[PDB]
Amino acid sequence: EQSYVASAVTPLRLNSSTKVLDMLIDSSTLEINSSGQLTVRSTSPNLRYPIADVSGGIGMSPNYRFRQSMWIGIVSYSGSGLNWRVQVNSDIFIVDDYIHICLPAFDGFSIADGGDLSLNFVTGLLPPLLTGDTEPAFHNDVVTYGAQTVAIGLSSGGAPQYMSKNLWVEQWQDGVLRLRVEGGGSITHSNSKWPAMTVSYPRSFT
Amino acid sequence: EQSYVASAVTPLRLNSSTKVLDMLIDSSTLEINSSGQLTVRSTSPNLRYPIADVSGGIGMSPNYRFRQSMWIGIVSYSGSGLNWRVQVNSDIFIVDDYIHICLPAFDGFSIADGGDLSLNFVTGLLPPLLTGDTEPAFHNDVVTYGAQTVAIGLSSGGAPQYMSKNLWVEQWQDGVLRLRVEGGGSITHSNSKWPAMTVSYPRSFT
Amino acid sequence: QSYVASAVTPLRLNSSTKVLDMLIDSSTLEINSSGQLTVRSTSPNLRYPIADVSGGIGMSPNYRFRQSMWIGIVSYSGSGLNWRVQVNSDIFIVDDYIHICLPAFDGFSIADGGDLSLNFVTGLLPPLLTGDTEPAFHNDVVTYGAQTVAIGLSSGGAPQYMSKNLWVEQWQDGVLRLRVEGGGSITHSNSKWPAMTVSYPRSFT
């Protein structure tokens, strides 16, 4: 005649024997209605935390924006001829890509001109928080991060003498955060009055 | 209503009478071009702050990343007997989920070994900012956040003597931010030289 | 022998060849290797820091954390006193903040009030550039990130630590100026500066 179908270009296909005309569709992205209509299979957007589904729209995960917990653990000082430890109760605040360990004021013993203050995160963290969550973005690299000046009260029983010492995040290894404390010179003493200190550093992600 | 030849499998359908061949399409998901082409319906994704439209593309609202304003208000000290206030002009910087109150150096009066420094945000905040914008993510919980060592000059008219005192964000209550100032020992004085100080803490979002 | 008069779009029957095909918008649809019509997977128009994190929409890890270092000159100037020291500091860009982790160093005399300038014109290692150190407040004079720092002043003997006030004052043409003042002073010729971390919101454009 002057009107019929000889060939059929994909996705269309005409079976040469039965002459049935059908269409090839990718079932993972398309489907056919109960009404026999061709439709697109609705799929939800693929989001990577911190990007998330907030109130139906695409937003920022509130967990990422603010998370709180606390650590009830052992803080230990180590220096030339010295080694002691104190139990401390500190709040933990994870805001964006930063972790903040809010240490309270505490009493310690003698300190050398240079020493290390170690926070043991292997134990003490309130679930669902874990040791791994305290890892810095720079992992276990030795750095001089967040250096700050801190005034510690040194005494031998009498009125304390406040020495200004330099403190910074030095390294995190196997769940133990090591802080370097040094400088300011030293006087003979047996006790120390440490001020409340907030230690912050970029937290490791993904 | 009508009848179609079994030869065209849905979504295709051959009208047995008119012998017109057409296709069934779910209009809510598919449409036909001006060029007669089958196309997918363009969907508009819902974005939730901080995720916003950045020049047609999907990005992070510049408002969330950085905002600047200022507070011209009253800073008041209170410490067992001693009580006084000073007017201060400070810049406010909201960067990501943090608020930064950049207090300038100011002169105050006597201070006790332990006391509170209150910033009154119910008044003095410059638009667009509102008192509510200063609420911490931990809203009114008593904490020991952002503890730091600060050197204050104490004097009685003569050359000042600088005492190292411990300062931290203690609590935010009904628009008033209370900072704890203590430790470091005291000396007899009538005036105090406070250094410029930046108070930072995670800002509330909902 | 099998009449088929007319094919409604997107279908189209060529009256000459009698070939039946379909019109599809290639920007939204495509045809499989298996000859199946499928939805064309395209990525949306994303703006940094929002990136295409392995298949989906995520936050670029580059925005969350980026490290580098500066090997440059730190120079002090105040009431006629001028001097410089070479310093090696780590630089950490986390979110919208830049952190210059300065190490402890030795300097010379300092006045009651002076400026400490970090020259970012040179010394920045990849992927950093001078422009990357610009604050969000550009070259506005501010009193940002004020903190108390203890510097050791000496004349050769045991140092005396004076508590001085320090803050980010201004960034200009690649040079970050820090104000150092207050706390009084004493006669000295040398200074022991402690390690200091300078942080401020980084510019984005």
mmCIF file with all atom_site columns, all heavy atoms in Angstrom, chain B residues 50-62:
data_model
loop_
_atom_site.group_PDB
_atom_site.id
_atom_site.type_symbol
_atom_site.label_atom_id
_atom_site.label_alt_id
_atom_site.label_comp_id
_atom_site.label_asym_id
_atom_site.label_entity_id
_atom_site.label_seq_id
_atom_site.pdbx_PDB_ins_code
_atom_site.Cartn_x
_atom_site.Cartn_y
_atom_site.Cartn_z
_atom_site.occupancy
_atom_site.B_iso_or_equiv
_atom_site.pdbx_formal_charge
_atom_site.auth_seq_id
_atom_site.auth_comp_id
_atom_site.auth_asym_id
_atom_site.auth_atom_id
_atom_site.pdbx_PDB_model_num
ATOM 1  N N   . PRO B 1 50 ? 20.766 26.232 55.436 1.00 0.00 ? 50 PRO B N   1
ATOM 2  C CA  . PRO B 1 50 ? 21.696 27.047 54.646 1.00 0.00 ? 50 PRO B CA  1
ATOM 3  C C   . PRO B 1 50 ? 21.849 26.738 53.155 1.00 0.00 ? 50 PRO B C   1
ATOM 4  O O   . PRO B 1 50 ? 22.503 27.503 52.448 1.00 0.00 ? 50 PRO B O   1
ATOM 5  C CB  . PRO B 1 50 ? 23.017 26.865 55.388 1.00 0.00 ? 50 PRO B CB  1
ATOM 6  C CG  . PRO B 1 50 ? 22.914 25.491 55.930 1.00 0.00 ? 50 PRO B CG  1
ATOM 7  C CD  . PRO B 1 50 ? 21.506 25.477 56.466 1.00 0.00 ? 50 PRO B CD  1
ATOM 8  N N   . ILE B 1 51 ? 21.302 25.621 52.677 1.00 0.00 ? 51 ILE B N   1
ATOM 9  C CA  . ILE B 1 51 ? 21.405 25.297 51.252 1.00 0.00 ? 51 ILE B CA  1
ATOM 10 C C   . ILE B 1 51 ? 20.407 26.183 50.522 1.00 0.00 ? 51 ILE B C   1
ATOM 11 O O   . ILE B 1 51 ? 19.214 26.162 50.816 1.00 0.00 ? 51 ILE B O   1
ATOM 12 C CB  . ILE B 1 51 ? 21.094 23.818 50.958 1.00 0.00 ? 51 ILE B CB  1
ATOM 13 C CG1 . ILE B 1 51 ? 22.049 22.920 51.746 1.00 0.00 ? 51 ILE B CG1 1
ATOM 14 C CG2 . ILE B 1 51 ? 21.237 23.545 49.464 1.00 0.00 ? 51 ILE B CG2 1
ATOM 15 C CD1 . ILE B 1 51 ? 23.519 23.253 51.540 1.00 0.00 ? 51 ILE B CD1 1
ATOM 16 N N   . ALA B 1 52 ? 20.895 26.974 49.582 1.00 0.00 ? 52 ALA B N   1
ATOM 17 C CA  . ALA B 1 52 ? 20.032 27.884 48.859 1.00 0.00 ? 52 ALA B CA  1
ATOM 18 C C   . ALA B 1 52 ? 20.463 27.961 47.420 1.00 0.00 ? 52 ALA B C   1
ATOM 19 O O   . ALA B 1 52 ? 21.437 27.318 47.016 1.00 0.00 ? 52 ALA B O   1
ATOM 20 C CB  . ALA B 1 52 ? 20.109 29.261 49.488 1.00 0.00 ? 52 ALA B CB  1
ATOM 21 N N   . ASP B 1 53 ? 19.723 28.739 46.642 1.00 0.00 ? 53 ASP B N   1
ATOM 22 C CA  . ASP B 1 53 ? 20.061 28.922 45.247 1.00 0.00 ? 53 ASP B CA  1
ATOM 23 C C   . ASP B 1 53 ? 21.147 29.983 45.132 1.00 0.00 ? 53 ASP B C   1
ATOM 24 O O   . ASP B 1 53 ? 20.990 31.114 45.596 1.00 0.00 ? 53 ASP B O   1
ATOM 25 C CB  . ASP B 1 53 ? 18.847 29.344 44.426 1.00 0.00 ? 53 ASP B CB  1
ATOM 26 C CG  . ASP B 1 53 ? 19.196 29.555 42.968 1.00 0.00 ? 53 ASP B CG  1
ATOM 27 O OD1 . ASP B 1 53 ? 19.441 28.546 42.279 1.00 0.00 ? 53 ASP B OD1 1
ATOM 28 O OD2 . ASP B 1 53 ? 19.269 30.721 42.523 1.00 0.00 ? 53 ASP B OD2 1
ATOM 29 N N   . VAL B 1 54 ? 22.257 29.595 44.526 1.00 0.00 ? 54 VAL B N   1
ATOM 30 C CA  . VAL B 1 54 ? 23.387 30.484 44.329 1.00 0.00 ? 54 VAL B CA  1
ATOM 31 C C   . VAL B 1 54 ? 23.576 30.660 42.827 1.00 0.00 ? 54 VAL B C   1
ATOM 32 O O   . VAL B 1 54 ? 24.206 29.837 42.171 1.00 0.00 ? 54 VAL B O   1
ATOM 33 C CB  . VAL B 1 54 ? 24.660 29.886 44.954 1.00 0.00 ? 54 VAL B CB  1
ATOM 34 C CG1 . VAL B 1 54 ? 25.859 30.775 44.679 1.00 0.00 ? 54 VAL B CG1 1
ATOM 35 C CG2 . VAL B 1 54 ? 24.458 29.697 46.443 1.00 0.00 ? 54 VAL B CG2 1
ATOM 36 N N   . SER B 1 55 ? 22.965 31.706 42.281 1.00 0.00 ? 55 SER B N   1
ATOM 37 C CA  . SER B 1 55 ? 23.058 31.991 40.853 1.00 0.00 ? 55 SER B CA  1
ATOM 38 C C   . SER B 1 55 ? 22.576 30.837 39.978 1.00 0.00 ? 55 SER B C   1
ATOM 39 O O   . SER B 1 55 ? 23.323 30.339 39.141 1.00 0.00 ? 55 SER B O   1
ATOM 40 C CB  . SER B 1 55 ? 24.496 32.366 40.472 1.00 0.00 ? 55 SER B CB  1
ATOM 41 O OG  . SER B 1 55 ? 24.874 33.594 41.072 1.00 0.00 ? 55 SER B OG  1
ATOM 42 N N   . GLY B 1 56 ? 21.336 30.405 40.177 1.00 0.00 ? 56 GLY B N   1
ATOM 43 C CA  . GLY B 1 56 ? 20.808 29.322 39.365 1.00 0.00 ? 56 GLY B CA  1
ATOM 44 C C   . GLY B 1 56 ? 21.279 27.951 39.812 1.00 0.00 ? 56 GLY B C   1
ATOM 45 O O   . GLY B 1 56 ? 20.544 26.964 39.669 1.00 0.00 ? 56 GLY B O   1
ATOM 46 N N   . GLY B 1 57 ? 22.496 27.882 40.344 1.00 0.00 ? 57 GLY B N   1
ATOM 47 C CA  . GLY B 1 57 ? 23.035 26.623 40.827 1.00 0.00 ? 57 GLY B CA  1
ATOM 48 C C   . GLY B 1 57 ? 22.685 26.388 42.285 1.00 0.00 ? 57 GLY B C   1
ATOM 49 O O   . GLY B 1 57 ? 22.217 27.294 42.982 1.00 0.00 ? 57 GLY B O   1
ATOM 50 N N   . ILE B 1 58 ? 22.890 25.163 42.745 1.00 0.00 ? 58 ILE B N   1
ATOM 51 C CA  . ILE B 1 58 ? 22.604 24.798 44.129 1.00 0.00 ? 58 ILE B CA  1
ATOM 52 C C   . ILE B 1 58 ? 23.870 25.021 44.934 1.00 0.00 ? 58 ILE B C   1
ATOM 53 O O   . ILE B 1 58 ? 24.930 24.490 44.595 1.00 0.00 ? 58 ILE B O   1
ATOM 54 C CB  . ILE B 1 58 ? 22.185 23.308 44.246 1.00 0.00 ? 58 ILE B CB  1
ATOM 55 C CG1 . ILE B 1 58 ? 20.857 23.087 43.525 1.00 0.00 ? 58 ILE B CG1 1
ATOM 56 C CG2 . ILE B 1 58 ? 22.094 22.880 45.706 1.00 0.00 ? 58 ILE B CG2 1
ATOM 57 C CD1 . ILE B 1 58 ? 20.396 21.665 43.539 1.00 0.00 ? 58 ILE B CD1 1
ATOM 58 N N   . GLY B 1 59 ? 23.764 25.802 45.999 1.00 0.00 ? 59 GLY B N   1
ATOM 59 C CA  . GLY B 1 59 ? 24.934 26.059 46.804 1.00 0.00 ? 59 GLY B CA  1
ATOM 60 C C   . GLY B 1 59 ? 24.621 26.287 48.262 1.00 0.00 ? 59 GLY B C   1
ATOM 61 O O   . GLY B 1 59 ? 23.590 25.845 48.776 1.00 0.00 ? 59 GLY B O   1
ATOM 62 N N   . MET B 1 60 ? 25.516 27.017 48.915 1.00 0.00 ? 60 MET B N   1
ATOM 63 C CA  . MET B 1 60 ? 25.392 27.342 50.325 1.00 0.00 ? 60 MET B CA  1
ATOM 64 C C   . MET B 1 60 ? 25.145 28.851 50.466 1.00 0.00 ? 60 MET B C   1
ATOM 65 O O   . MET B 1 60 ? 25.955 29.665 50.011 1.00 0.00 ? 60 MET B O   1
ATOM 66 C CB  . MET B 1 60 ? 26.685 26.933 51.029 1.00 0.00 ? 60 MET B CB  1
ATOM 67 C CG  . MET B 1 60 ? 26.660 27.025 52.535 1.00 0.00 ? 60 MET B CG  1
ATOM 68 S SD  . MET B 1 60 ? 28.246 26.495 53.179 1.00 0.00 ? 60 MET B SD  1
ATOM 69 C CE  . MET B 1 60 ? 28.007 24.731 53.168 1.00 0.00 ? 60 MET B CE  1
ATOM 70 N N   . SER B 1 61 ? 24.011 29.216 51.059 1.00 0.00 ? 61 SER B N   1
ATOM 71 C CA  . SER B 1 61 ? 23.649 30.618 51.251 1.00 0.00 ? 61 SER B CA  1
ATOM 72 C C   . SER B 1 61 ? 24.790 31.430 51.828 1.00 0.00 ? 61 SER B C   1
ATOM 73 O O   . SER B 1 61 ? 25.280 31.152 52.928 1.00 0.00 ? 61 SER B O   1
ATOM 74 C CB  . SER B 1 61 ? 22.444 30.754 52.177 1.00 0.00 ? 61 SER B CB  1
ATOM 75 O OG  . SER B 1 61 ? 22.159 32.125 52.410 1.00 0.00 ? 61 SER B OG  1
ATOM 76 N N   . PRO B 1 62 ? 25.227 32.461 51.097 1.00 0.00 ? 62 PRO B N   1
ATOM 77 C CA  . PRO B 1 62 ? 26.325 33.286 51.604 1.00 0.00 ? 62 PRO B CA  1
ATOM 78 C C   . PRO B 1 62 ? 26.059 33.888 52.999 1.00 0.00 ? 62 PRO B C   1
ATOM 79 O O   . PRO B 1 62 ? 26.999 34.170 53.744 1.00 0.00 ? 62 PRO B O   1
ATOM 80 C CB  . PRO B 1 62 ? 26.500 34.338 50.500 1.00 0.00 ? 62 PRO B CB  1
ATOM 81 C CG  . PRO B 1 62 ? 25.198 34.302 49.731 1.00 0.00 ? 62 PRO B CG  1
ATOM 82 C CD  . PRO B 1 62 ? 24.848 32.857 49.733 1.00 0.00 ? 62 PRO B CD  1
#
